[PDB]
């Protein structure tokens, strides 16, 4: 059930993004692409490492839920890229914000694919 996982993930992703917009001031635009949405099915193995890498920097409880959902959509033990999180504070916030933005966009895109 691809549709079921999208609907499971969507409120988690919306909340994470909107809470970041409300709490964090002055986050610069990174202009980077981090998440690859699709492989074609939703690309858990491309998205998962990023969520694993920001887990200590974010809400561990929601991230855990996201990871549990996305693991179900890793149709193999495909390999996971090792992610370099920026050390600089502003780069690091832009990195997190870009992940949340692109995750939001991916799910909304795949949801339009499904309707």
């Amino acid at each position: 059930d691809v549709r079921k996982i999208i609907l499971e993930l969507q409120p988690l992703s919306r909340g994470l993004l909107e809470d970041y917009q409300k709490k964090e001031t002055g986050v610069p635009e990174s202009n980077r692409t981090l998440l690859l949405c699709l492989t074609p099915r939703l690309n858990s193995s491309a998205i998962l490492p990023y969520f694993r890498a920001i887990r200590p920097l974010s809400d561990k409880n929601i991230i855990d839920k996201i990871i549990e959902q996305l693991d179900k959509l890793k149709f193999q033990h495909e390999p996971e890229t090792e992610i370099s999180v920026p050390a600089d504070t502003f780069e690091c916030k832009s990195f997190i914000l870009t992940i949340l933005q692109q995750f939001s966009a991916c799910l909304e895109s795949v949801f339009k694919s499904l309707n």
Partner: antibody
Amino acid sequence: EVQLVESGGDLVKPGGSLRLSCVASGFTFSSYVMSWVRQIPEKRLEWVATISSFGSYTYYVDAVKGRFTISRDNAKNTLYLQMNSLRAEDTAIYYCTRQTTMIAWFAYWGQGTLVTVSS
Amino acid sequence: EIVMTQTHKFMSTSVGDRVNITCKASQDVGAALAWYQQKPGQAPKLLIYWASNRATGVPSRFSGSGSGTDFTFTISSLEPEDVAVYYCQQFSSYHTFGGGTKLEIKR
């Protein structure tokens, strides 16, 4: 290319209402905070209102609170400003702008739509 | 509310000269300051953010400095296309703008 296009500006009497629209293209609209900024004839800039990606959080400048309402329709890539109880000093060019978080700077601006309130 | 004060509404300069535009905040904003340039009939354009980061494509003659409450926008060598109005803006807290400084050419 990122594009913001405002519409709805017009001539109104004090106490009237007006609804502004801003249609965005070139980015995933729901990924970004959006805001209105206005510029009065004397060319001072004043931030007006701000809305988070899915509408859960909004901020208003005091001068417009309880008269203006910011909202968005992500399906149509559209930002709105509902303006009630208009006054002469609301006369300004209204710009819609894109931001990363709710408190930030304004890297992208539309061309603006002129609102004139006069008896 | 954080008040941003640009002391000079207008400044005269000459092409080729250094220009120093000042902005002072009523409270500490750290480095959370942005500078915009505006030409007639156009929306303001972002030049500097986080007090000194030049936005993409902005010419190198423009720069910003300061942290805390006192900020400086500098054009190292004024060029004719630089005649415009410059505004500061803080984003430590709810957005406020300085009142603008209009550059005009001395003769």
